[PDB]
Design a protein around this ligand. Structure first.
Ligand SMILES: NC(=O)c1ccc[n+]([C@@H]2O[C@H](COP(=O)([O-])OP(=O)(O)OC[C@H]3O[C@@H](n4cnc5c(N)ncnc54)[C@H](O)[C@@H]3O)[C@@H](O)[C@H]2O)c1
Ligand SMILES: NC(=O)c1ccc[n+]([C@@H]2O[C@H](COP(=O)([O-])OP(=O)(O)OC[C@H]3O[C@@H](n4cnc5c(N)ncnc54)[C@H](O)[C@@H]3O)[C@@H](O)[C@H]2O)c1
Ligand SMILES: NC(=O)c1ccc[n+]([C@@H]2O[C@H](COP(=O)([O-])OP(=O)(O)OC[C@H]3O[C@@H](n4cnc5c(N)ncnc54)[C@H](O)[C@@H]3O)[C@@H](O)[C@H]2O)c1
Ligand SMILES: NC(=O)c1ccc[n+]([C@@H]2O[C@H](COP(=O)([O-])OP(=O)(O)OC[C@H]3O[C@@H](n4cnc5c(N)ncnc54)[C@H](O)[C@@H]3O)[C@@H](O)[C@H]2O)c1
Ligand SMILES: [Cl-]
Ligand SMILES: [Cl-]
Ligand SMILES: [Cl-]
Ligand SMILES: [Cl-]
Ligand SMILES: [Cl-]
Lengths: 334, 333, 333, 333
């Protein structure tokens, strides 16, 4: 069993990866970290978190390492993945969280740099892409580079799966009202080519493209090409919600849709259920990838024309991370 | 009837007066009712967190505002039946408190000596007006009317245009809506709406709204064919409405965009953009709705088609501009 | 041991219960009074926008909350003299409504059957306790006591240490303070504080506070020597207190900081940090005040010296841990 | 001189243009350098999250902006020496990038054919100007000059008036300051400054500034007498500076306010308010600083006296107005 892990990109997602690993007392062992800064700065960011608060374990550092819960972790500072000295500590599986290696072509650099497998924390083109407890059974021993898609995908997928299986989804469109992230702007200024991303993220509702629905065929093959959607990025720091409007393959009531979602969430560590009147901050630190909200279910019908709107919460930082880590633990034991 | 009183000199009520002054209306605000002192109403009029300084002079006396040199009586009667509207001859009441959103309740303004009420919110089965959609329905004998919600003013012009051009068979709405005074600053009781008891500037809060459900009051042919809800989020004003529809015809995005553009032409109430705007860009809008071509989306599989269309709105000032047009026509009957 | 009643199950009132259970306190909370239904209180206790899910089970009946399987009676009496405290034998009331902040007002809890009241806000000239500064001034005869504001609880430990080590000749205080429920979500009337009427999540808002003015109730040697005020800013909790002092002695930054470290040693109410923290890092703190040596500043010209000292506080949970420490001593008397 | 280039079409860079157009300056912006396309600078000039739509037409080509029907070249040179300032006759450079804050560094604008540079930030030991305090120190032989920070333009007028009337023997400043582009959107490395790495809109963030430390360049007799810092907070623009001074005379609050009223009278750079304003009320201010008499505070204990004076400022637009004033005068020498 491959127990030894490297994290590339010790950011929002990367830091939480470590946090979650120590929280579930995993046999997986983080032996090296690569970013662009000093151990001092990484230690400060790891110790102090604006969203989840103080790190639950001891954090200290050296000129070339972090010391977390008494255990030493090497820190490297290589912009180019192929130069990361992963063999020095035996980093076997790389959790790729930088945002700059989101393809097989790009992420294979880690293999050149001496790692064995790569798990990418973002969509990454047409490669094996896993949403745990939806399609993790498609994983095998020959998968060497894998994607876990976006938080949004981990939110949409299990909801869509439940619907697909119970009723059919003949066509649908998704809007996620999504917390702001590092790809957006603090103040109005250039942010590559996306004009909207240029705008101050905490002062606006900002429409934003996402591939979650578009590329859903990678997770649920039978819905391939049948979903579209987008994001409205809004001023909350983490916690998001996905709405899916579907034409289903069967006439339904709200109760029928809600019972089917309940069943699919039963005995399911990835996919939660609620009928409580919750709001976005209640999902912060969720250990699910998705939490279906029965109180938002809505059936609109005129004769035989039926629209069905299903809604699910997700903590796009930690909740997602819990999915990444479930996927990682299975990856390592193949 | 050129003389007006305002009940509820709140976010809507105050902007009502700003807008009347902005368009040099021959309507005359003579009286204002609220729950507080003139000092406090005057500070609030003078200094606005969303729109900045009042462009006119503002002073007060122990019973009045003086706005741009003109005296406006202030009353503090929590029951509308006790507002002395006849003292300064207030004929038309712009009801902006949120406590009289029905025929039965706003009757109190007429028992109190006014002739007409225009309610700044939905109010059941009464004439409900979205200006430049169904304003031709207003009548000389109408005494109590609604301008519905800001959300309704945003949805209706979009739904009207899609209805006329393609037909809407069924549809559902979500508005990503700026927070409002019906919500809470900090977590705490807010009557019986549990979601509304939560800190509004720190949460995405789902919230019910009749905008889609009551659309039949504005566009009879769409009666019962829409439903919808809001997601309240931390921006102070400026909101967006997404409508997802099954249309009566197969379409292209370009065809939808051009139909909509046609409907916005020479339309003081319904605006158009294909610029990559965000919500703060709608703050101060003088339209009730601004349709956004950049977010049009056609999802097609074989014969099936879903069409997502989206319009922005300044739920405060933009809605107010619709309220004033509706009031300018209401007063000349 | 003792049985308590909570009046005002609000931001402070709910966190009092959370903290009592977290420390496995002997105190049993037996009754709660507020203005609403058990359903609404259970919703609010369960789901907290600042601290997340309640760590215990929460349920309700028509007259009660059930928390970790223990029943707590719920009443809805706006006048404290009508709260049936005797029905469950609540002898110590934790007064958290904002409406009984005087000895004559909180007396009504004793007329209703309680023995002692601890008030969760400044309450005039009464025994006013900052735990680990002046908790020794409590005795078997006190029946109504105050714990001051969160700001007093931030200020008084810093001021006491400076007092004891160097003397404070005079000083002034400014706290950059999270917004609270006394402010407004949207621009609108809020009693006679004009500034409190303005949208709290969208402004820096100057705001009056007695923490400095009434510090003598907690540190008698400093009566009349300190003034200050707050700037309310848009963070939901997490506040910081700066104090500019002329000290009695003449000092280096290092020396100020050593004095404060000693004062924070084996002191569960008052903490120290030399880490570059920001306000969200204090959220959930089990201190009333955390002195920050990084912000210490000595400005000096000739024999003239200004000393600025800065301390953080979670005005919500942090304060509450102080209230609970004080509440535990006050029960045992 | 009437021919200017802007390096750094950022928050400050864009408002420079907006302001020159607002005052009908007979300076013309002929060229603009940044790191992006004309399409992106046009989108940004046209849509502003703080100040709304551009008041004038904005269009572009692949190498220019068309603003109010006039062409302005756009270049994208990382290094200032590589900028074709020569080409359109760029005489005075407004250096608003943050990256060329010295004489040596802004030299490069001269090495590429510009005469003068006006830097929009503190720039070490060079001629540093707060308009209507020390603009009389500008001469014809000046090439590279600074207008310091917004905080310096806030602090200087107030300090100047206190110094003239009473003397400041020593003093310390805290500015409660709107977040800027130098801070982080989410927790992440921002060079070596640990505090600047933290999410700016979710925290009160202590932060260093030289406004007080370098006041000597603006007010030579206050040299080395002041210190201070900032608490960055979650508002988008609009800040406030607090100064605690030991003055050279005993004073009342009335005496301190009248002296400030006098200094502000027919002073287009420095404003006065007796109204209970909040940060958003300063947004769009045409002053560098607005002294607020409602926050003046005198703490007296015998011969010892601390005086807190407080001034508001729009760190974006308000600072800009000072910049222009200085620019217009720099041009004519
Ligand atoms: N934030 C979310 O909501 C979220 C959710 C799910 C997935 N993701 C995805 O996870 C990835 C990381 O997101 P994030 O939000 O943590 O971003 P982030 O900016 O917080 O973190 C990126 C980290 O990588 C470092 N980095 C950048 N370039 C690098 C390089 N060449 N080499 C090494 N380190 C480098 C940065 O210094 C930073 O620590 C992205 O692909 C993102 O799309 C994000
Ligand atoms: N804010 C928006 O986005 C928006 C948009 C469109 C319509 N509306 C509607 O307009 C109405 C007002 O909304 P708002 O945002 O201005 O509310 P708000 O809370 O800002 O204002 C309400 C005003 O009414 C006063 N008031 C309350 N009860 C009263 C009584 N019994 N008598 C007299 N005055 C009383 C308050 O003091 C306050 O000044 C509501 O019906 C609301 O649904 C709001
Ligand atoms: N930062 C803080 O929030 C903080 C810190 C220290 C002290 N305090 C003090 O504690 C007290 C409460 O502050 P809060 O933030 O919890 O307020 P809050 O508004 O969150 O809580 C008040 C609660 O009291 C209830 N209430 C109001 N009037 C009542 C009455 N007559 N009878 C019974 N219940 C009533 C409300 O329904 C609400 O649940 C205040 O005196 C406040 O100054 C607050
Ligand atoms: N924001 C404020 O409140 C404020 C107030 C007073 C002074 N200032 C000062 O003004 C300057 C600009 O601040 P800002 O807030 O506008 O920053 P900003 O980040 O908005 O603007 C910086 C602009 O410079 C551009 N840029 C960066 N490097 C460049 C280069 N090498 N060549 C050309 N362009 C480059 C960026 O693309 C951006 O458009 C800073 O020096 C700051 O200290 C800012
Ligand atoms: Cl590489
Ligand atoms: Cl898509
Ligand atoms: Cl509905
Ligand atoms: Cl005081
Ligand atoms: Cl300094």
């Amino acid at each position: 069993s491959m127990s030894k892990v490297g994290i590339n990109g010790f950011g929002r997602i990367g830091r939480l990866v470590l946090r979650r690993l120590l929280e579930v007392k995993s046999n997986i062992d983080v032996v090296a970290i690569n970013d662009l800064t000093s151990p001092k700065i990484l230690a400060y960011l790891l110790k102090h978190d604006s969203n989840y608060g103080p790190f639950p374990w001891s954090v200290d550092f050296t000129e070339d390492s972090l010391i977390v819960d008494g255990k030493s972790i090497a820190v490297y500072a290589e912009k180019e993945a192929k130069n990361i000295p992963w063999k020095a500590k035996g980093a076997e599986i790389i959790v790729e969280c930088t945002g700059f290696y989101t393809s097989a072509e790009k992420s294979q650099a880690h293999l050149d740099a001496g790692a064995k497998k790569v798990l990418i924390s973002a969509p990454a083109g047409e490669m094996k892409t896993i949403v745990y407890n939806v399609n993790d059974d498609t994983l095998d021993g020959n998968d060497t580079i894998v994607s876990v898609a976006s938080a949004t995908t981990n939110c949409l997928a299990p909801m869509a799966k439940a619907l697909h299986d119970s009723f059919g989804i003949e066509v649908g469109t998704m809007t996620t009202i999504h917390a702001y992230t590092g790809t957006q702007s603090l103040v109005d200024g250039p942010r590559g080519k996306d004009l909207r991303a240029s705008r101050a993220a905490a002062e606006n509702i900002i429409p934003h493209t996402t591939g979650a629905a578009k590329a859903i065929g990678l997770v649920i093959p039978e819905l391939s090409g049948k979903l579209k959607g987008h994001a409205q990025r809004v001023p909350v720091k983490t916690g998001s919600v996905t709405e899916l409007v579907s034409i289903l393959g069967k006439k339904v009531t709200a109760e029928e849709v809600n019972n089917a979602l309940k069943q699919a969430t039963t005995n399911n560590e990835s996919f939660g259920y609620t009928d409580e009147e919750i709001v976005s901050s209640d999902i912060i630190g969720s250990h699910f990838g998705s939490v279906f909200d029965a109180t938002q279910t809505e059936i609109t019908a005129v004769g035989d024309l039926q629209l069905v709107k299903t809604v699910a919460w997700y903590d796009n930082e930690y909740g997602f991370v819990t999915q990444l880590i479930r996927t990682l633990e299975k990856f390592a034991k193949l």
